[PDB]
Design a protein around this ligand. Structure first.
Ligand SMILES: O=C(COc1ccc(Cl)cc1)N[C@H]1CC[C@H](NC(=O)COc2ccc(Cl)cc2)CC1
Lengths: 318, 317
C-alpha cells in the first residue's frame, strides 16, 4: 500500500533524474525485487487483471526513462512468464502465485550468473597475440577480457568516449591485470582499424532486428569494422534484449546536457550555436557478426527467435 | 653479321626453351646489350629503316615467347628513345652516339633500381608489423631483408602450388632474422583477418594499371580488397608493358602439369584435363600502390608512365 507506492515513486524518480544504480545488473535485480514486492502484496482474480496492472505500471516505468529499456523488457519478460503460467494452468490462486514466485526466483538465479557464463565462454573467442578494440565502459566486456587474459597474452585498445571519458577507468582497471592496454581518442578509430584484429564491445539495448543502441561512436566503429572486414563481438546479457523497433517509436537517443561537449566558459558564441550531445548511437544488424550471451553465441539473424523465446507480440506496445 | 646472327638465334632459343637467364635484371641488361650490339654494326640512312628493323626483331622476340614481354617493352623503350632523338634532331649523323649514351644511362638507371626501392622502402614498414608475400622475387626479398635492419616485424610467406618458390625466399629471409612464417596458399583468407599489409611483386604491369604475376595473387588481392588492407607492388620500370589484357587470349603461360598431377597417378590421367597456369591476372582496383625506383605511384597514374616510357604507335610492334 504505502510502502509499495513510495518504492514505486522513488524508483520512477530515480530513473527520471539520473543513473540509479550504476550497473545494469543491480537495476535488473531491483526491478525483479519491485515486481515481486508488487505481486506478493496485491489481489487479483484473473491473470488479465495482473497483466493490465503490470502494463499500467510499466507504462509509467518507460515514461520515466525511455532510454533505459531494461525495466521495459524485464516487465515484458515477467508478463510473458504470467502468460505462460496462465496457459499451462488453464489447459489457480495460491499455486499459480507460488509458480510465478519460483519462476522469478529462478530468473534471478539466471540473472546472477550471466557474467560468469560470458567469462567462461570467453576462452573460445580470444587467441594469443591479439589486438582487441573496445569502446566505452561495461563490466561484461571487462570480465570477458580479464578472464581471457588469465591464460592468453594479447593487447586491448580501449578507446575513450568524447562527451565523457568513461574508458579511462576501464583502461586503468584492465592495466592492473596486465593486458597491455592502449588508450587513444575517438578520432583515431579508422586510423587504427588497419591493425585491429577483432572488435569486442558491449551494448546498452539489443533491438529486435539484430540492431543495437549503444554508447556513441560505436556506429562509426562498426562501419570501420565492416570496411576492414573484422568480426564484431557483442558481450551482452539477456536483459538488454528488447523488441522496440528503431524507426517505430520516437525518443531513440538520450540527449544530455551540452556542458560535457562545449563548456559554459566559451563566451558570447554560445547563443548563436546549437550544441547537441547524443550519448547513444544506433548500429544496424548488418555491421554485427556475433552476439555473445550466457546461453552462448548467436547470429544477428537469430535474435527474433530469442524474441519468440522471451517476448509475446501482444506485449510489444506495453 | 655472323656473330650477330648466332647471338640473336641463341637468344631466341634460350627464350623459347626455358628461363635463361634467371632474374629479370640480368636478362634486361643482356637485351639492352643485344640492342646496342645490333645498332653499332648496321647501316641506315633514315631512322625509319632502323625503326622497322628493331620492329622486325622485336616481333621475332615476342614470337619466341609471348608471355615474356620484358624484351618486348625494352625494344619498345629503345624505339621511343630513337623516336624522341629523331624528333629533337629533326626540329643527322650524330644520332648513333646519342642512342649509345642513352642506352648507357638507361643501363645505369637499370643497375640502380633495386637499391632505390630499398632506399624508399623505409617509409612503408613500421615496427611490430605482419607482412604477406606470395611467390619469390629478389626485389621484395631485398626490400624486407634491408627493412629489417632497423625495424622488427613479421613476414608471412605463402608458397606457390605449381612451383614451391616461397621456400627459398623463406630460408633467405630467415637468415636475416625477420621471424618469417611459412604457410601454404590455402589459408590465405584464413590468415587475411590478421594481415596488416601485403608486400608483393609482379611479372608484368599492364597499361591500365592491371598486372600479371605469379599464380594465386589474384585470390590474394581479392582477399586484401575484402579486408581493405593496402597492397604494395614492388616492381621496377622494365616490367611495365602496354599489352592490354583482352588481346588475342594469350595471357597465361601454361606449363607442364606434372607439378599439379604426377605421371604416377594411374589410368585416371587419360580421362582428366589438368591445366597449370603459372601466371594470374589482377585488376587495378585491387591494387593500392606501385613502388618503382622513382617512387610510389597510384594504379590510376600508370598511364602517365605509359606516356613517359612508351609510344602508342609501337604497341603492336
Ligand atoms: O603488438 C601489438 C599491439 O597492437 C597494437 C597496439 C596499439 C595500437 Cl594503437 C595498435 C596496435 N600487436 C601485435 C599482435 C601480434 C601481431 N603478429 C605477430 O606477432 C606474428 O605475426 C603473425 C605470424 C603468423 C601468423 Cl599465421 C599471423 C601473424 C603483431 C602485432
Amino acid at each position: 500500500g504505502s510502502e509499495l507506492s513510495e518504492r514505486i515513486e522513488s524508483f520512477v524518480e530515480t530513473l527520471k533524474r539520473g543513473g540509479g544504480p550504476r550497473s545494469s545488473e543491480e537495476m535488473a535485480r531491483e526491478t525483479l525485487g519491485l515486481l515481486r514486492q508488487i505481486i506478493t502484496d496485491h489481489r487479483w482474480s484473473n491473470a488479465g487483471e495482473l497483466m493490465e496492472l503490470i502494463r499500467r505500471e510499466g507504462r509509467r516505468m518507460t515514461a520515466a526513462q525511455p532510454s533505459e529499456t531494461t525495466v521495459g523488457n524485464m516487465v515484458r519478460r515477467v508478463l510473458k512468464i504470467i502468460r505462460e503460467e496462465y496457459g499451462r494452468l488453464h489447459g489457480h490462486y495460491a499455486q499459480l502465485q507460488s509458480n510465478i514466485i519460483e519462476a522469478i526466483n529462478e530468473l534471478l538465479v539466471e540473472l546472477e550468473g550471466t557474467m560468469e557464463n560470458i567469462a567462461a565462454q570467453a576462452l573460445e573467442h580470444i587467441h594469443s597475440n591479439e589486438v582487441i578494440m573496445t569502446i566505452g565502459f561495461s563490466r561484461t566486456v571487462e570480465a570477458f577480457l580479464k578472464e581471457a587474459a588469465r591464460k592468453r597474452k594479447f593487447h586491448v585498445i580501449v578507446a575513450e568516449c568524447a562527451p565523457f571519458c568513461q574508458g579511462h577507468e576501464m583502461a586503468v582497471n584492465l592495466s592492473k591485470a596486465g593486458i597491455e592496454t592502449t588508450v587513444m581518442t575517438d578520432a583515431a578509430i579508422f586510423a587504427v582499424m588497419s591493425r585491429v584484429n577483432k572488435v569486442i564491445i558491449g551494448t546498452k539495448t539489443i533491438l529486435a532486428n539484430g540492431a543495437l543502441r549503444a554508447v556513441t561512436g560505436t556506429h562509426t566503429l562498426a562501419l570501420a569494422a565492416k570496411h576492414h572486414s573484422t568480426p564484431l563481438i557483442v558481450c551482452a546479457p539477456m536483459f538488454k534484449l528488447s523488441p522496440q523497433f528503431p524507426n517505430e517509436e520516437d525518443s531513440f537517443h538520450k540527449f544530455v546536457a551540452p556542458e560535457e561537449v562545449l563548456p559554459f566558459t566559451e563566451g558570447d558564441i554560445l547563443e548563436k550555436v546549437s550544441v547537441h550531445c547524443p550519448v547513444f548511437d544506433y548500429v544496424p544488424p548488418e555491421l554485427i557478426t556475433l552476439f555473445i550471451s550466457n546461453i552462448g553465441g548467436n547470429a544477428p539473424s537469430y535474435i527474433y527467435r530469442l524474441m519468440s523465446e522471451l517476448y509475446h507480440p501482444d506485449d510489444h506496445v506495453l
